[PDB]
Structure 1
């Protein structure tokens, strides 16, 4: 909409108060004019028609239960935008300040979220498996990272290419969570998953086998479900990214950690410079090794640690 930039206030899915950039024209809309070509949050009104209607509010206060998912989708899209801008000098997902659009209250009891090619979409969960999914900063960043991937490597969503695509979203979703610095960890979706169970999540990057996911190439899923195990074999890459950052000894192979910022730099460079739509794990190893070489030098600890991490997960 055309209007005046304003700042509203509400509460997110987890009861936390936060300010949100809005636009005033008769109503206050969830439209942040401060970030690129804007951040727009919509209400899917429990239907599956997208995007739905640009979120409108009479008084610029967003403290209703129904408001909560919108507040977070809007806010966390903005934090994710800041991350890519401040950390990687990337302007929105296309690198050209593309408008970022999100819809909440997608369908009824919908236990997922997604990038649809055009926008992020969030279910409300069924209240047992999930609460509204935009409540997880790593979930939001995960979904918006799919758009980054679409515009860069274009990793195809199947098999090894797709498991890399998934891992990239888990990796940057996690790095955004650390950037925002609110209860950061190496698990995925812990903030919105299973409101009746403490300390679980959908996936773990530090120990993927915790939730049934492979942590070594020998344990890769080779079947056809989940597009050839894209959310399953991502555990192999997530584990490598975790080791690169934090270090550790995994199946007897030792990795010296180089930290989250270097992990991000190396994987961001691999993603934007070397990965292609059909890149496999082995080609990802080469991309990451070359990326660390470009950044730190062929004889650097950083290159050695990337090599150790891929060795540790059996990716040569």
Structure 2
């Protein structure tokens, strides 16, 4: 809609307060005109038709429980935009400032969130397995990063390519969570998963095995479930990335950590310059080594640590 750019206030899914960019025209709409061609957030009102209605609020205050998932989808879409813009000079998911549209209250008891090719879609969860999924900034950014992948490398969603696809989304999901600088960690989905249970998550990048995922190529899953293990074998690459950033000794191989910003630069370059739709783990290693070489030099610590990390998780 046309209207005046305004700033509202509300509380997200975890009960934290935040200001949000809105547009005023009789009602205050979740439309943020300050980022690219706009961030728009929609109410699907428990249906499955998309996008639903552009979210309208009478008073620019979003403290109702029903408002929480809209506040977070809207705000975290903004943070994800700022991360790609400020850190990588990428304008929105497509690099051309495309509108970011999200729908919340999709369906009922729906334990999932997804990028559908055109927009973000968030279930509210069933209240046991999940609370509303837009409450997890890593989930928001993980899924928007699938759009970035589709507009770049076009990694296939099956087998080792598909596991790299998943890991890219966990890596940038986590780097956005650190960028937002409120409650970051190397777990995925900890904010929205299992409200009954403290301190768990869907998966861990620092210790994939904590949740049953492989942390070494010799443990790779080779069945056909989960599209050839895309959420499973991602642990191998997630661990390599965790090691590159933070360092550690993993199966006796020592990795010198180089920090988050350099991890992000190296993988973002690998994703946008070097990976192809069918890149496998070994080709990802080569892409990462080449990216680090381009950015830091073939004799740099950064290249040496990329190699140590991939060695540690058994990917040659």
CA distance in 2, matches of 1:142, 1:239: 16
1:135 Cα deviation after fit: 0.5
CA distance in 1, matches of 2:54, 2:143: 19
1:60 Cα deviation after fit: 1.1
1:19 Cα deviation after fit: 0.6
CA distance in 2, matches of 1:55, 1:310: 45
CA distance in 1, matches of 2:302, 2:83: 22
Q: Give per-residue Cα distances to partners, 1:110-141, cap 9 Å, x unaligned.
A: 11111111111111111111111100111111
1:27 Cα deviation after fit: 1.4
Q: Give per-residue Cα distances to partners, 1:251-291, cap 9 Å, x unaligned.
A: 11111000000000000000010001111111100000000
Q: Give per-residue Cα distances to partners, 1:80-100, cap 9 Å, x unaligned.
A: 100011111111011110000
Tell me the SS of whatever aligns to 2:65. Answer: coil
1:68 Cα deviation after fit: 0.2
Aligned to 2:94: 94
CA distance in 2, matches of 1:41, 1:229: 32
1:47 Cα deviation after fit: 1.2
1:9 Cα deviation after fit: 0.8
Q: Which moved more, 1:49-58 or 1:92-101?
A: 49-58
1:150 Cα deviation after fit: 0.7
1:23 Cα deviation after fit: 0.7
Tell me the SS of whatever aligns to 2:106. Answer: coil
CA distance in 1, matches of 2:235, 2:102: 27
Aligned to 1:219: 219
1:76 Cα deviation after fit: 0.3
Tell me the SS of whatever aligns to 2:42. Answer: strand
CA distance in 2, matches of 1:277, 1:52: 33
Tell me the SS of whatever aligns to 1:169. Answer: helix
Q: Give per-residue Cα distances to partners, 1:16-66, cap 9 Å, x unaligned.
A: 111110111121110000000000001111111111111111111111100
1:7 Cα deviation after fit: 0.8
CA distance in 1, matches of 2:262, 2:221: 29
- Cα RMSD for the two superposed structures: 0.7
CA distance in 1, matches of 2:47, 2:166: 26
Contiguous gaps of at least 5 residues in structure 2: none
Q: Give per-residue Cα distances to partners, 1:147-178, cap 9 Å, x unaligned.
A: 11111111111111110010001000100111
CA distance in 2, matches of 1:57, 1:198: 33
TM-score by length of 2: 0.99
Aligned to 1:190: 190
CA distance in 2, matches of 1:205, 1:125: 23
After TM superposition, where is structure 1 displaced by more than 4 Å over at least 4 residues in a row?
Answer: none
CA distance in 2, matches of 1:230, 1:53: 33
Contiguous gaps of at least 5 residues in structure 1: none
Tell me the SS of whatever aligns to 1:66. Answer: helix
1:197-216 paired onto structure 2 within 5 Å: 197-216=197-216
TM-score by length of 1: 0.99
Aligned residues: 316
CA distance in 2, matches of 1:312, 1:191: 29
Aligned to 1:278: 278
